[PDB]
Design a protein around this ligand. Structure first.
Ligand SMILES: CC(C)(C)c1cc(C(=O)N2CCS(=O)(=O)CC2)c(NC(=O)Nc2ccc3ccccc3c2)s1
Ligand SMILES: CCCCCCCCO[C@@H]1O[C@H](CO)[C@@H](O)[C@H](O)[C@H]1O
Length: 332
């Protein structure tokens, strides 16, 4: 190809097809609202910051682009376009990603509306539906939180990742277990759910040690079956040096809530990750009877992440990223 145009926005320089107009900053690496003229819809444009500065940077640009190109589901961000001003590989230095503009995050909705039980079902249902799709590609989100969830005026929701976070984090990620099953995202969904029922942060941790403290008051210190699975002797004693706590009865904590929502929370917010309900299982739970449709909860196409285990040169990553730009076929 098209013809590009240059525009300086808050000291940053944006070169984009003319297709997109009325570029407006949305804060922070830098995203702009824009008007797409080919369709007359509002978009969000992201300029990748310092994309190829290190090997690790370069691999991450490639990672994000491969990921976004693969995600094709109603409850997950999808790529509308990706472009570079560069006419060639030599010239390649910037990447821009295009997605549908949603002008509210779940945070902002929870500020000034107390959601009805029925809202909580539809919202959480959409998180699990997107999550079933992401998990079926063998991807873990790892940083699920209201500010990564986009919501429109029909309260339709999509999952994304802009790139305290700590409030929705699985206890295992914060003790650096390094394994991590997919249910770390289920833990996060539990924290989101409670805050939608309640209006308040389930675990408003002051810091990393305060975070863990609050989690254990609710869920309890590890029971005997859990300790049996803990391989490291230091970790075992570290767990034995924390004030020991009984599991609370959730019925007693979430006082006036749908008893089916309570029973769901009990299935998500379990210390032992092997015992958390999965996304697929939770879609089928009685709380979502009004929304559940087993024929409309699709899974992902095989996702090849063999790249995650390669150590390559900046310009290799760079060139792989370039192939991916060129081969983009936009959605209908
Ligand atoms: C798990 C899942 C939800 C599917 C995502 C992973 C990543 C990701 O790239 N990774 C790899 C990089 S990182 O390691 O920093 C995090 C995980 C997303 N990336 C993403 O959501 N990117 C965005 C965000 C806002 C946009 C605004 C306008 C236009 C374009 C936009 C694209 S979404
Ligand atoms: C005191 C707080 C400690 C947190 C207990 C974390 C238990 C999480 O669960 C553990 O997850 C691992 C994968 O991450 C699995 O290999 C283990 O089998 C599983 O029990």
């Amino acid at each position: 190809r098209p013809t590009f145009y240059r525009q300086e926005l808050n000291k940053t320089i944006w070169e984009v097809p003319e297709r997109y107009q009325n570029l407006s900053p949305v804060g922070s690496g830098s995203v702009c609202a824009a008007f797409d003229t080919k369709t007359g819809h509002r978009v969000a444009v992201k300029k990748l910051s310092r994309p190829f500065q290190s090997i690790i940077h370069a691999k991450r640009t490639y990672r994000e682009l491969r990921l976004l190109k693969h995600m094709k589901h109603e409850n997950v961000i999808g790529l509308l376009d990706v472009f570079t001003p560069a006419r060639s590989l030599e010239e390649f230095n910037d990447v821009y990603l295009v997605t549908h503009l949603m002008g509210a995050d779940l945070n902002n909705i929870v500020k000034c509306q107390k959601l009805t039980d029925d809202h909580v079902q539809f919202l959480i249902y959409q998180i699990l539906r997107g999550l079933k799709y992401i998990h079926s590609a063998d991807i873990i989100h790892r940083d699920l939180k209201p500010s990564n969830l986009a919501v429109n005026e029909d309260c339709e929701l999509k999952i994304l990742d802009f790139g305290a976070t700590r409030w929705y984090r699985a206890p295992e990620i914060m003790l650096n277990w390094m394994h991590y099953n997919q249910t770390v995202d289920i833990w996060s969904v539990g924290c989101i759910m409670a805050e939608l029922l309640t209006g308040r942060t389930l675990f408003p941790g002051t810091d990393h040690i305060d975070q863990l403290k609050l989690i254990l008051r609710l869920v309890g210190t590890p029971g005997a079956e859990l300790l049996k699975k803990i391989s490291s002797e230091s970790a075992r004693n570290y767990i034995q040096s924390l004030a020991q706590m009984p599991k609370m009865n959730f019925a007693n904590v979430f006082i006036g809530a749908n008893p089916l929502a309570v029973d769901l929370l009990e299935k998500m917010l379990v210390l032992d990750s092997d015992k958390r309900i999965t996304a697929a299982q939770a879609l089928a739970h009685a709380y979502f009877a009004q929304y559940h449709d087993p024929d409309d909860e699709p899974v992902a196409d095989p996702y090849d992440q063999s790249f995650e285990s390669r150590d390559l040169l900046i310009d290799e990553w760079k060139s792989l990223t370039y192939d991916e730009v060129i081969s983009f076929v936009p959605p209908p």
